[PDB]
């Protein structure tokens, strides 16, 4: 089966964790400023096809109204089942620059919920340390696997030449805010990914 | 004599037009966002040493107070004498992306002064057309020469391989707003260049 080209970067149409997962959304992170676009990463979102059954309260809704519906994305983020994010570096950067973008996104959300406590701080520190020790060359790959059987996340960094590097995040709140960074509707870091997911899910939910 | 390294790009310490001109300020254009710096261009500002005599109303002022003094930079922009800007591309871009940044900076200033009239529009169109036909490879060089003897500007684009390409801007108002884009104090496109000029001129004005 053919790779899906996401802004000229190949993505598998299916990934298997504990279950077969389908590519149901993809997009990029970028900035458009001074009449210029600069692309940072490409993203693929992999979900169980059965997620359409968990999202039946939104059947008949269009992609445009699902794209602006933060309750919908809240349900998707918390739906039961396996989930997997695949991120491919476009602009080379220091690992610690992604670390701090992540840390700031997670800390901000924890603080807003008053959940920035000892365990969250310790878990987030371990994630920051993990990225601090990496260099994100172009086509490097970060993956976030969210298993259905625990409120944890396994983070893998892969780059040609080196062996895969891995950590497991054990704090549920930190794991939730990582999911929200990428998947929280109008607050997601990648509006293109949100629109693709929302359009793909609206179509599946109409059937 | 040694080249002056401006963020790893060489700049002559002196350029000769109608008169010998000294490098009195240099800096970069950049964006700092998402905990990351992206550098667009390096700038050198070349002025007659005699400009210190035209700026005597600001003698005894420090670099920090000259850096926040828009009357000072207004006097520098309009002072008599030869002036030369040298811009070296760091991030490769389309010519039309610099064209539109320029056009938007000039048009905005003309509009604020209600000077966006037929002649200005025609002159600015010719500048936009000039850049539209170029590709700004890294280390390409844009120079703006402002002669003391007319209210005009000669723009030169140079890149290795190709011959120099040149146009002459004949509209005084457009030429003034180009100078202000780069040199207008707290409104300049390059705060680093402003600070360097202001510190260099403060020191010379103290002698």
Residue numbers in the entry:
A (entry chain A), B (entry chain A): 41 to 247
Pull text from the paper.
Chalcone isomerase–like (CHIL) protein is a noncatalytic protein that enhances flavonoid content in green plants by serving as a metabolite binder and a rectifier of chalcone synthase (CHS). Rectification of CHS catalysis occurs through direct protein–protein interactions between CHIL and CHS, which alter CHS kinetics and product profiles, favoring naringenin chalcone (NC) production. The chalcone isomerase–like (CHIL) protein family is noncatalytic, yet it shares a “CHI fold” with CHI. The protein X-ray crystal structures of PpCHIL-A and VvCHIL reveal CHI-type α/β folds with high structural homology to each other.
When the structures of VvCHIL and MtCHI-I bound with naringenin are aligned, a significant amount of the VvCHIL pocket is occluded. Most notably, tryptophan 221 (W221) and glutamine 141 (Q141) produce overlaps with naringenin. Nearby to the tryptophan in the structure of VvCHIL, a glutamine (Q141) also occupies the canonical binding site, yet this glutamine is not highly conserved across CHIL sequences. On the other hand, the presence of the tryptophan and glutamine side chains create a fundamentally different chemical topography for the VvCHIL-binding pocket, potentially changing the nature of ligand interactions. Supporting this idea, analysis of the VvCHIL-binding pocket reveals a pocket volume of 20.8 A3, whereas the volume of the PpCHIL-A–binding pocket is significantly larger, calculated to be 50.7 A3. The comparison of VvCHIL and PpCHIL-A protein crystal structures suggests that W221 may be responsible for the destabilizing effect to VvCHIL caused by naringenin binding. With the W221L substitution in place, VvCHIL does not undergo thermal destabilization in the presence of naringenin. Similarly, a variant of VvCHIL with the Q141A substitution does not undergo thermal destabilization in the presence of naringenin, suggesting W221 and Q141 together are required to facilitate destabilization. For VvCHIL, naringenin binding produces the opposite effect on the thermal shift relative to PpCHIL-A and MsCHI-II, resulting in reduced protein Tms at high naringenin concentrations. The VvCHIL peaks calculate to 26 kDa (major peak) and 68 kDa (minor peak), indicating that a minor amount of VvCHIL is stable as a multimer, perhaps as a trimer in this experiment.
